[PDB]
Amino acid sequence: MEALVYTFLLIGTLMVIFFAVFFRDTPR
Amino acid sequence: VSLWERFCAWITSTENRLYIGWFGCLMFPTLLTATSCFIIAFIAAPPVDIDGIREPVAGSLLYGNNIISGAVIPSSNAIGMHFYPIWEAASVDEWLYNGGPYQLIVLHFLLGVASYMGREWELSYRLGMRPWIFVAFSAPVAAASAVFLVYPIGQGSFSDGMPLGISGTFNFMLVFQAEHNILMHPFHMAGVAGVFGGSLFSAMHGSLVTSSLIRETTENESTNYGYKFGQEEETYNIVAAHGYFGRLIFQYASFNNSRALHFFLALWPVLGIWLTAMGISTMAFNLNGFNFNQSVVDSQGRVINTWADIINRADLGMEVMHERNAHNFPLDL
Amino acid sequence: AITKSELNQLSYLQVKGTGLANRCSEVIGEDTITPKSGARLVDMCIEPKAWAVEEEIGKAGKTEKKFVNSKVMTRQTYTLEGIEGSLKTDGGKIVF
Amino acid sequence: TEGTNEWFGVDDIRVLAVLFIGHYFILSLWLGQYGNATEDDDADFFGEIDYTGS
Amino acid sequence: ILGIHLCLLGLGALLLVAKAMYLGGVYDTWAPGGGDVRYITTPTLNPIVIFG
Amino acid sequence: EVQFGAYLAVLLGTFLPVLFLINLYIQTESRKAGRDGGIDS
Amino acid sequence: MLTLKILVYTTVIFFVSLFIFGFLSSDPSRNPNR
Amino acid sequence: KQLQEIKHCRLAMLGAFGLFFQALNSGEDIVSQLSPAFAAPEYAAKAGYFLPQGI
Amino acid sequence: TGPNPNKQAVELNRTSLYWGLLLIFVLAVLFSSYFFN
Ligand code: CLA
Ligand code: CLA
Ligand SMILES: CCCCCCCCCCCCCCCC(=O)OC[C@H](CO[C@@H]1O[C@H](CS(=O)(=O)O)[C@@H](O)[C@H](O)[C@H]1O)OC(=O)CCCCCCCCCCCCCCC
Ligand SMILES: CCCCCCCCCCCCO[C@H]1O[C@H](CO)[C@@H](O[C@H]2O[C@H](CO)[C@@H](O)[C@H](O)[C@H]2O)[C@H](O)[C@H]1O
Ligand code: OEX
Ligand SMILES: [Cl-]
Ligand SMILES: [Fe+2]
């Protein structure tokens, strides 16, 4: 039942990375 | 304008959010398939017989592993260095029983990282830069290739490659120290010096540059807000930093030229990593480190021990216990 | 290939990797042998071609002991070869 | 199979057919742009990079 | 220049072949009766084998 | 098998700081929008 | 399993040909000093 | 046409010389000499494909 | 692409905050016993 927790944490980290890359503050 | 010309114009365009280029045509599909297979295998793969003795080992989360202990097991010892694609198996279940995904992941991944290096050079060329960043990136690529491909080639089996897990690397390192006596190879010493010196130089450079900031904010504003994108200010008010470094140590040792300083910064860790990767590649063919066991004797002829003998005892303890059921004969050739 | 005489005409480099080494040979004819005394069966080969495991399955509102088919997880390493024995006759019957 | 020594792993006609189809399709697309090149001695240049149009 | 030095390389390869076939022979480790020096009298020329 | 309190520890210690940081960012953006006169106050 | 081999071969040759014929299309002239 | 004729004449002189001497040396015609070197010798080609399907 | 003229602001005064907090806490108090069973 902890496999759910592990999967949730990993997918959340990947979502954070996606949002950081594609929704980012403009450097200008 | 032909269709091919328009396609070529789009591929090599600098207006895209992420550059594609022609090395991208190889980088993207391979990396994507490797990522998909790795995620699926790490989550839900069945146990794999790695030693060829019909003793499967579990490595997936669904089979009772946590993040630290989970891994993707290398292929079976019975396969050896033979190519094992999916279509060469009688069924997908047999492919998963013999550690099929490892070969797929490692091969598509190595192709991907080589294409990544090429793409770095290509964008540098298109932007009008100098073409030597990918030379710096070549060292981690060399190390990863060294382990994953070169060690199995020398030892004669894919089952000796580094597992794709956290504790798999620990197992790999312990067995490698037991069998090859690393930590006495000078190339490993070079690599350790490289990483330690890289960290030291990074900390020194950061401290020196940050200390020499000019006052433009006062108190209620983070000091990072004083810099503007496009501001012209050389990366160190000299008198301060130069005098500080000339007074801290022997004065004649002070880099007053930025080009030489940054060149040395680039040179040190890259050379260290190159040397350690070559050390691993050479030890893949059984050219081990220094051996000083029983080298000091008294007048009569009895043996006086040193620290190398204690290291040897630890190596013997590691050696007699690894792969317990796999050996049948006295020598581990 | 199929008979021993054809198999002996190939070289080892010509058989490696094909999968012919795990096969069993074929015989052609319908005659009689009648073993003398001091005979020995030599070069016996046994090759399975189907596997099944006893279990309990449900057919229609009932459960029975039925043999279910299974897939070989290993590879072509399951053929027995080279078996030898000594033949004899007890009361007109052969014993291996 | 696995350890046999076929050229490029080709063991069937379909594999050879698809390889030919791929190389030829991309080749025809490239030809649609570079199929009018001539070898006459005035399309050459004297330099390090061919800037002479097409 | 490339063609000239390439022709030289080809001549060198043919010289090795001539040494193997006529000028004493080479050491063959698969010799019938123990490894020894012998003349290679019938080299294979079928292009399928070489290019395979 | 595993300890039950780890569920509570992991989930709470992950969820609370995330919401704290999101609140910080959102209040900063709201103050910035308020300072510059516009349709959204 | 043969159909999987056919599809994979098609994909690989497609991408490799894209690479090969892309680098032949007067690549050295695609620089900002044209 | 005259240029083509003379070129083909010289080339055919060379070709006829080569064909005649190859036939004399090998004791065979050109077809039986080139045909074997197209697929494989028998002693080198693999036995075949014997892996059972469906297991 | 451009500046959307349909964006607006969201407000919440202290009284509504107190009402929401009280509602959430009281609802949890009521349903906890049945959730635990
Ligand atoms: C304090 C002690 C100490 C120190 C400092 C080191 C230091 C080192 N050891 Mg070591 N070692 C030690 C003790 C120590 N060792 C002991 C006691 C043992 C015996 C048990 C060993 C046994 C040992 C072995 C067996 C090996 C080392 C290796 C190394 C080197 C690591 C190479 C590396 O990380 O860069 C290399 C960098 C990489 C591999 C990274 C590649 C990155 C790829 C290209 C891209 C990855 C991208 C990623 C997948 C996706 C990113 C995510 C995305 C979202 C951004 C390093 C010099 C290794 C070595 O020499 O390497 C060749 C090695 O094989 N050591
Ligand atoms: C394709 C070239 C080739 C290859 C594969 C070999 C292979 C061999 N030779 Mg040989 N040889 C060659 C050319 C070649 N030779 C030539 C041209 C000469 C004349 C100088 C000789 C002279 C020679 C002698 C005198 C002897 C050998 C011997 C040997 C054997 C062991 C030596 C060894 O380690 O080989 C190392 C060879 C290589 C690493 C070559 C690999 C080349 C690969 C295929 C790439 C080539 C393509 C290249 C990149 C060009 C690109 C073209 C461009 C359009 C892209 C081995 C079977 C020895 C032996 O066993 O004899 C009994 C021996 O005594 N050779
Ligand atoms: C016994 C032989 C056996 C083999 C030994 C090989 C030794 C090769 C020595 C020459 C190699 C190139 C020297 C540097 C060139 C350059 O990049 O300049 C960059 C500057 C030169 O100084 C800068 O030089 C400038 C002048 S000039 O342009 O370089 O002429 C000057 O303007 C500036 O102020 C100054 O900072 O050098 C550095 O700051 C980088 C430091 C690392 C470079 C190597 C320095 C010497 C190392 C000795 C060998 C160490 C062995 C380590 C073993 C792992
Ligand atoms: C040729 C591929 C079709 C697949 C059928 C069987 C696959 C086994 C061999 C495939 C790969 C081996 O490479 C192959 O090269 C030769 C041609 O280049 C083949 O030879 C083939 O082509 C010759 C030339 O027309 C024909 O006369 C032969 O009948 C044919 O067998 C060999 O059979 C094989 O060695
Ligand atoms: O797999 Mn990995 O470690 Ca190279 O030695 Mn033998 O094998 Mn196993 O034992 Mn020791
Ligand atoms: Cl053993
Ligand atoms: Fe800077």
Coordinates of N, CA and C in Angstrom, one line a residue, chain B residues 182-313:
Chain B
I182 N 40.6 -1.3 -6.5 CA 40.6 0.1 -6.7 C 40.8 0.7 -5.4
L183 N 41.0 2.0 -5.3 CA 41.6 2.8 -4.3 C 43.1 2.7 -4.2
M184 N 43.7 1.8 -5.0 CA 45.2 1.8 -5.1 C 45.6 2.1 -6.6
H185 N 44.6 2.3 -7.5 CA 44.9 2.7 -8.8 C 45.1 4.2 -8.9
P186 N 46.2 4.7 -9.4 CA 46.4 6.2 -9.5 C 45.4 7.0 -10.2
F187 N 44.7 6.3 -11.2 CA 43.6 7.1 -11.9 C 42.4 7.4 -11.0
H188 N 42.1 6.5 -10.1 CA 41.0 6.8 -9.1 C 41.5 7.9 -8.2
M189 N 42.7 7.9 -7.8 CA 43.2 9.0 -7.0 C 43.1 10.3 -7.8
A190 N 43.4 10.3 -9.1 CA 43.2 11.5 -9.9 C 41.8 12.0 -9.9
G191 N 40.8 11.0 -10.0 CA 39.4 11.4 -10.0 C 39.0 12.0 -8.7
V192 N 39.4 11.4 -7.6 CA 39.1 11.9 -6.3 C 39.6 13.3 -6.1
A193 N 40.9 13.5 -6.5 CA 41.5 14.9 -6.5 C 40.7 15.8 -7.3
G194 N 40.2 15.4 -8.5 CA 39.4 16.2 -9.4 C 38.1 16.7 -8.7
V195 N 37.4 15.8 -8.1 CA 36.1 16.2 -7.5 C 36.3 17.1 -6.3
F196 N 37.3 16.7 -5.4 CA 37.6 17.5 -4.3 C 38.0 18.9 -4.6
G197 N 39.0 19.0 -5.6 CA 39.4 20.3 -6.0 C 38.4 21.1 -6.8
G198 N 37.5 20.4 -7.5 CA 36.4 21.2 -8.1 C 35.5 21.8 -7.1
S199 N 35.1 21.1 -6.0 CA 34.3 21.6 -5.0 C 35.0 22.8 -4.3
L200 N 36.3 22.6 -4.0 CA 37.1 23.7 -3.4 C 37.1 25.0 -4.2
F201 N 37.4 24.8 -5.5 CA 37.5 26.0 -6.4 C 36.1 26.6 -6.6
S202 N 35.0 25.8 -6.7 CA 33.7 26.4 -6.8 C 33.4 27.3 -5.6
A203 N 33.7 26.7 -4.4 CA 33.4 27.5 -3.1 C 34.2 28.8 -3.1
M204 N 35.5 28.7 -3.5 CA 36.4 29.9 -3.4 C 35.9 30.9 -4.4
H205 N 35.5 30.5 -5.6 CA 35.1 31.5 -6.6 C 33.8 32.1 -6.2
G206 N 32.8 31.3 -5.7 CA 31.6 31.9 -5.2 C 31.8 32.9 -4.1
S207 N 32.6 32.6 -3.1 CA 32.9 33.5 -2.0 C 33.5 34.8 -2.5
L208 N 34.6 34.7 -3.3 CA 35.3 35.8 -3.8 C 34.4 36.8 -4.6
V209 N 33.6 36.2 -5.5 CA 32.8 37.1 -6.3 C 31.7 37.7 -5.5
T210 N 31.0 36.9 -4.6 CA 29.9 37.5 -3.9 C 30.4 38.5 -2.9
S211 N 31.6 38.4 -2.3 CA 32.0 39.3 -1.3 C 32.3 40.7 -1.9
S212 N 32.7 40.7 -3.2 CA 33.1 42.0 -3.8 C 32.0 42.7 -4.5
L213 N 30.7 42.5 -4.1 CA 29.6 43.2 -4.6 C 29.6 44.7 -4.2
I214 N 29.2 45.5 -5.2 CA 29.1 47.0 -4.9 C 27.7 47.3 -4.3
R215 N 27.7 48.3 -3.4 CA 26.4 48.6 -2.7 C 25.5 49.4 -3.6
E216 N 24.3 48.8 -3.9 CA 23.3 49.5 -4.6 C 21.9 49.3 -4.0
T217 N 21.7 48.3 -3.3 CA 20.5 48.2 -2.3 C 21.0 48.5 -0.9
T218 N 20.1 48.8 0.0 CA 20.5 49.3 1.3 C 20.2 48.3 2.4
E219 N 19.0 48.0 2.7 CA 18.8 47.0 3.7 C 17.6 46.1 3.4
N220 N 16.5 46.7 3.0 CA 15.2 45.9 2.9 C 15.0 45.5 1.5
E221 N 16.0 44.7 0.9 CA 15.9 44.2 -0.4 C 17.0 43.2 -0.6
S222 N 16.7 42.1 -1.2 CA 17.7 41.0 -1.4 C 18.8 41.5 -2.3
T223 N 20.1 41.2 -1.9 CA 21.2 41.8 -2.7 C 21.2 41.3 -4.1
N224 N 20.5 40.2 -4.4 CA 20.4 39.7 -5.8 C 19.7 40.6 -6.7
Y225 N 18.9 41.5 -6.1 CA 18.0 42.4 -7.0 C 18.8 43.6 -7.6
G226 N 20.1 43.8 -7.2 CA 20.8 44.9 -7.7 C 21.3 44.7 -9.1
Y227 N 21.4 43.4 -9.6 CA 21.9 43.1 -10.9 C 20.7 43.1 -11.9
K228 N 21.0 43.7 -13.1 CA 20.0 43.8 -14.2 C 20.4 43.0 -15.4
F229 N 19.5 42.4 -16.0 CA 19.8 41.5 -17.2 C 20.3 42.4 -18.3
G230 N 21.6 42.4 -18.6 CA 22.2 43.3 -19.5 C 23.1 44.3 -18.9
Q231 N 23.3 44.3 -17.6 CA 24.2 45.2 -16.9 C 25.6 44.9 -17.2
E232 N 26.4 46.0 -17.3 CA 27.8 45.9 -17.6 C 28.6 46.1 -16.3
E233 N 29.1 45.0 -15.7 CA 30.0 45.1 -14.5 C 30.8 43.8 -14.5
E234 N 32.1 44.0 -14.6 CA 33.0 42.8 -14.6 C 32.8 42.1 -13.2
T235 N 33.0 40.7 -13.3 CA 32.5 39.9 -12.2 C 33.4 39.9 -11.0
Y236 N 33.9 41.1 -10.6 CA 34.7 41.2 -9.3 C 35.4 42.6 -9.2
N237 N 35.0 43.4 -8.3 CA 35.7 44.7 -8.0 C 37.1 44.3 -7.6
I238 N 38.0 44.4 -8.6 CA 39.4 43.9 -8.3 C 40.1 44.3 -7.0
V239 N 40.3 45.6 -6.7 CA 41.2 45.9 -5.6 C 40.8 45.0 -4.4
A240 N 39.5 44.9 -4.1 CA 39.1 44.2 -2.9 C 39.5 42.7 -3.0
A241 N 39.0 42.0 -4.0 CA 39.2 40.6 -4.1 C 40.7 40.3 -4.3
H242 N 41.3 41.0 -5.2 CA 42.8 40.8 -5.5 C 43.6 41.0 -4.3
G243 N 43.4 42.0 -3.5 CA 44.1 42.2 -2.3 C 43.8 41.2 -1.2
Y244 N 42.6 40.7 -1.2 CA 42.2 39.7 -0.2 C 42.9 38.4 -0.5
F245 N 42.9 38.0 -1.8 CA 43.6 36.7 -2.1 C 45.1 36.9 -2.0
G246 N 45.7 38.1 -2.3 CA 47.1 38.2 -2.2 C 47.6 38.3 -0.7
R247 N 46.7 38.7 0.2 CA 47.1 38.7 1.6 C 46.8 37.4 2.3
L248 N 45.7 36.7 1.8 CA 45.4 35.4 2.5 C 46.5 34.4 2.4
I249 N 47.1 34.3 1.2 CA 48.2 33.3 1.0 C 49.4 34.1 0.4
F250 N 50.4 33.3 0.1 CA 51.6 33.8 -0.7 C 51.1 34.7 -1.8
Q251 N 51.7 35.9 -1.9 CA 51.1 37.0 -2.7 C 51.3 36.7 -4.2
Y252 N 52.4 36.1 -4.6 CA 52.7 35.8 -6.0 C 51.7 34.9 -6.6
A253 N 50.9 34.1 -5.9 CA 49.9 33.3 -6.4 C 48.5 34.0 -6.4
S254 N 48.2 34.6 -7.5 CA 46.9 35.3 -7.6 C 46.5 35.4 -9.1
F255 N 45.4 34.8 -9.5 CA 45.0 34.9 -10.9 C 44.4 36.3 -11.1
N256 N 45.1 37.1 -11.8 CA 44.6 38.4 -12.2 C 44.0 38.5 -13.6
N257 N 44.0 37.4 -14.3 CA 43.4 37.3 -15.7 C 42.2 36.4 -15.6
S258 N 41.0 36.9 -16.0 CA 39.8 36.1 -15.9 C 39.8 34.9 -16.9
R259 N 40.4 35.1 -18.1 CA 40.4 34.0 -19.0 C 41.2 32.8 -18.5
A260 N 42.3 33.0 -17.9 CA 43.1 31.9 -17.3 C 42.4 31.2 -16.2
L261 N 41.8 32.0 -15.3 CA 41.0 31.5 -14.2 C 39.9 30.6 -14.6
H262 N 39.1 31.0 -15.5 CA 38.0 30.2 -16.0 C 38.4 29.0 -16.8
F263 N 39.5 29.1 -17.5 CA 40.1 28.0 -18.2 C 40.5 26.9 -17.2
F264 N 41.2 27.3 -16.1 CA 41.6 26.4 -15.1 C 40.4 25.7 -14.4
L265 N 39.4 26.5 -14.2 CA 38.2 26.0 -13.6 C 37.6 24.9 -14.5
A266 N 37.5 25.1 -15.8 CA 37.0 24.1 -16.7 C 38.0 22.9 -16.8
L267 N 39.3 23.1 -16.7 CA 40.2 22.1 -17.0 C 40.3 21.0 -15.9
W268 N 40.3 21.5 -14.6 CA 40.6 20.6 -13.5 C 39.7 19.4 -13.5
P269 N 38.4 19.6 -13.2 CA 37.5 18.4 -13.0 C 37.3 17.5 -14.3
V270 N 37.4 18.2 -15.5 CA 37.2 17.4 -16.7 C 38.4 16.4 -16.9
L271 N 39.6 16.9 -16.6 CA 40.7 16.0 -16.7 C 40.7 14.9 -15.7
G272 N 40.2 15.2 -14.4 CA 40.1 14.2 -13.4 C 39.1 13.1 -13.8
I273 N 38.0 13.5 -14.3 CA 37.0 12.5 -14.7 C 37.4 11.7 -15.9
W274 N 38.1 12.3 -16.9 CA 38.7 11.6 -18.0 C 39.6 10.5 -17.5
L275 N 40.5 10.8 -16.5 CA 41.4 9.9 -16.0 C 40.8 8.7 -15.3
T276 N 39.7 9.0 -14.5 CA 39.1 8.0 -13.7 C 38.3 7.1 -14.7
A277 N 37.7 7.6 -15.7 CA 37.0 6.8 -16.7 C 37.9 5.8 -17.4
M278 N 39.1 6.4 -17.8 CA 40.1 5.5 -18.4 C 40.6 4.4 -17.4
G279 N 40.7 4.8 -16.1 CA 41.1 3.8 -15.2 C 40.1 2.6 -15.1
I280 N 38.8 3.0 -15.1 CA 37.8 1.9 -15.1 C 37.8 1.1 -16.3
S281 N 38.0 1.7 -17.5 CA 38.1 1.0 -18.7 C 39.3 0.1 -18.8
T282 N 40.4 0.5 -18.2 CA 41.6 -0.4 -18.2 C 41.5 -1.5 -17.2
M283 N 40.9 -1.3 -16.0 CA 40.7 -2.3 -15.1 C 39.6 -3.3 -15.6
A284 N 38.8 -2.9 -16.6 CA 37.9 -3.9 -17.3 C 38.7 -5.0 -17.9
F285 N 39.9 -4.9 -18.2 CA 40.8 -5.9 -18.8 C 41.8 -6.5 -17.8
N286 N 41.5 -6.4 -16.5 CA 42.3 -7.0 -15.5 C 43.7 -6.5 -15.4
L287 N 43.8 -5.2 -15.4 CA 45.1 -4.5 -15.0 C 44.8 -3.7 -13.8
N288 N 45.0 -4.4 -12.6 CA 44.5 -3.9 -11.3 C 45.5 -2.9 -10.7
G289 N 45.2 -2.4 -9.5 CA 46.0 -1.4 -8.9 C 47.2 -2.0 -8.2
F290 N 47.9 -1.2 -7.4 CA 49.1 -1.6 -6.8 C 48.9 -2.7 -5.8
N291 N 49.8 -3.7 -5.7 CA 49.8 -4.8 -4.8 C 51.0 -4.8 -3.9
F292 N 50.8 -4.6 -2.6 CA 51.9 -4.5 -1.6 C 51.7 -5.5 -0.5
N293 N 51.1 -6.6 -0.7 CA 50.8 -7.6 0.3 C 52.1 -8.4 0.7
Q294 N 52.5 -8.4 1.9 CA 53.7 -9.1 2.5 C 54.9 -8.6 1.8
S295 N 55.2 -7.3 1.9 CA 56.4 -6.7 1.3 C 57.4 -6.3 2.3
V296 N 57.2 -6.3 3.6 CA 58.1 -6.0 4.6 C 58.4 -7.2 5.5
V297 N 59.7 -7.7 5.5 CA 60.0 -8.8 6.3 C 61.2 -8.5 7.2
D298 N 61.4 -9.3 8.2 CA 62.5 -9.0 9.1 C 63.7 -9.8 8.6
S299 N 64.8 -9.8 9.5 CA 66.0 -10.5 9.1 C 65.8 -12.0 8.9
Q300 N 65.1 -12.6 9.8 CA 64.8 -14.0 9.8 C 64.0 -14.4 8.6
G301 N 63.0 -13.7 8.3 CA 62.1 -14.0 7.1 C 60.6 -13.9 7.4
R302 N 60.3 -13.6 8.7 CA 58.9 -13.5 9.0 C 58.3 -12.2 8.5
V303 N 57.0 -12.2 8.3 CA 56.3 -11.1 7.6 C 55.8 -10.1 8.7
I304 N 56.1 -8.8 8.4 CA 55.6 -7.7 9.2 C 54.5 -7.0 8.4
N305 N 53.3 -6.8 9.1 CA 52.2 -6.3 8.3 C 52.2 -4.8 8.2
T306 N 51.4 -4.3 7.3 CA 51.1 -2.9 7.1 C 49.6 -2.7 6.9
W307 N 49.2 -1.4 6.6 CA 47.8 -1.2 6.4 C 47.3 -1.8 5.1
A308 N 48.1 -2.0 4.1 CA 47.7 -2.7 2.9 C 47.2 -4.1 3.2
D309 N 47.8 -4.8 4.2 CA 47.4 -6.1 4.6 C 46.0 -6.1 5.2
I310 N 45.7 -5.1 6.0 CA 44.3 -4.9 6.5 C 43.3 -4.7 5.4
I311 N 43.7 -3.9 4.4 CA 42.8 -3.7 3.2 C 42.6 -5.1 2.5
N312 N 43.7 -5.9 2.5 CA 43.6 -7.2 1.8 C 42.7 -8.1 2.6
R313 N 42.7 -8.0 3.9 CA 41.8 -8.8 4.7 C 40.3 -8.5 4.4

